[PDB]
């Protein structure tokens, strides 16, 4: 399966002077990093989170981010001043950036920004641009961001070069866990509509009628349940899964 690497950043500006920025990093459905406002450094959530980068390499990458975060906070604040009174707090910015690895040596990177719940800006090619639906006033921030050539180079490198290099390294060290196979336990119940409670399974794809959403357990495993709406005397729940190995539930 072709995995997706996501760095998710969420910053909140409550007013002119108060602010915070917290991030989390996923590879497929498994958390690889955490970096909270309180913390001064990015933190590993797995043994292999550093991938096959060296310490030198990683210290150089983390410092770029340490600088980025402080810079980001101030710029957002100044861009608010530029556009105001058209802007107003509270403000919520979100960023998902990373790369999805395909068969062979093939990546497609991304950097998507959302403003107040809605996706409005992405990095594409060599510059920042707004996406369809975005409000017209962002053109000014975009002009200003695109003025900063140094940033553009650094983003171009991160997206084009560093991401897929790093993730190809991550996928090697994380083979163990990513390919790990855990068995589902399923228990039968009914409320006034039958319910089949499959839980504990990994990876995600599972053949469990009326399906629900994939709910996560705290040990990085998955919970799911399919309903079935008097006529119970001829029914029993069945589930297929990777971890079972030719033995259904």
């Amino acid at each position, epitope marked *: 399966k072709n995995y997706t690497f996501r760095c998710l950043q969420m910053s909140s500006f409550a007013n002119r002077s108060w602010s915070r920025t917290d991030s989390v990093v996923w590879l497929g459905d498994l958390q690889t990093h955490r970096w909270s406002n309180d913390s001064a450094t990015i933190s590993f959530t797995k043994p292999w989170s550093q991938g096959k980068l060296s310490n030198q390499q990683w210290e150089k990458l983390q410092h770029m981010f340490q*600088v980025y975060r402080v*810079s980001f906070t101030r710029d957002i604040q100044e861009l608010v*001043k*530029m556009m*105001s009174p058209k802007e107003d707090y509270p403000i919520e910015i979100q960023l998902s950036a990373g790369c999805e690895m395909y068969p062979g040596n093939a990546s497609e990177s991304f950097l998507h920004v959302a403003f107040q719940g809605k996706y409005v800006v992405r990095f594409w090619g060599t510059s920042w641009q707004t996406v369809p639906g975005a409000p017209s006033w962002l053109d000014l921030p975009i002009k200003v961001l695109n*003025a900063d*050539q140094g940033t553009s180079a650094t983003v171009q490198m991160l997206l084009n070069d560093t991401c897929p290099l790093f993730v190809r390294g991550l996928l090697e060290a994380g083979k163990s866990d990513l390919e790990k196979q855990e068995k589902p336990v399923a228990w039968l119940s009914s409320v006034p509509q039958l319910v089949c409670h499959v839980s504990g399974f990994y990876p995600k794809p599972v053949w469990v009628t009326h399906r629900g959403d994939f709910l996560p357990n705290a040990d990085e495993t998955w919970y799911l349940q399919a309903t079935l709406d008097g006529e119970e005397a001829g029914l029993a729940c069945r589930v297929k899964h990777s971890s079972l190995g030719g033995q259904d539930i």
Partner: T-cell receptor
Amino acid sequence: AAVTQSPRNKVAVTGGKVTLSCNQTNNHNNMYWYRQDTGHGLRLIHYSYGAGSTEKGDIPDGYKASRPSQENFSLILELATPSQTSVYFCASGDEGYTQYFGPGTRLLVLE
Amino acid sequence: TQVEQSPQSLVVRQGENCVLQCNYSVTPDNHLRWFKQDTGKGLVSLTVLVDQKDKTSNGRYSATLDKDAKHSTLHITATLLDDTATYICVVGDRGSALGRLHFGAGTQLIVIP
């Protein structure tokens, strides 16, 4: 890319009102007011991102700023003091990093 | 005072060369700019350095920038009387209008004719 300042030289009295004015015909959105003092680099007092905007700088206290239009940007001293005796520089800029500086204004505040 | 210049003043005989220092802690450090300011007058830009390791030259003025060392030097070759001025170092922390400039308090050069 010119930026003018009037007056180029000013003498004021403590408690009096002084208005320093800066014009620019570069159609720059952004303008800035600094003061130069011996033993210090230029220090940012106020700045504007366009008409109607003024923003407090690093040393805003004792000064109000007015941006009536794209072209003009004023520094206002309502109750002047001897400590506001300085040389005041205005500058302007577009989205880029360069700021283009005015020729300066020498303010002297006496008792 | 994230930008520091050295020396504070210097006196040279016309024809001699001089080097001026600028050291800084500003972060991040997008570009460094050298202004010349004549006694009484205002701020004329001489050069601006942008790269991690940069080297510029405008006439008899030439300059170096080292971002690892966060250090710059302005060289004046064959000084003239009109070089008698105050040379100011300015570091900008963005590559756009979102940046703030950070000024050193300058270095006085007197050239003896």
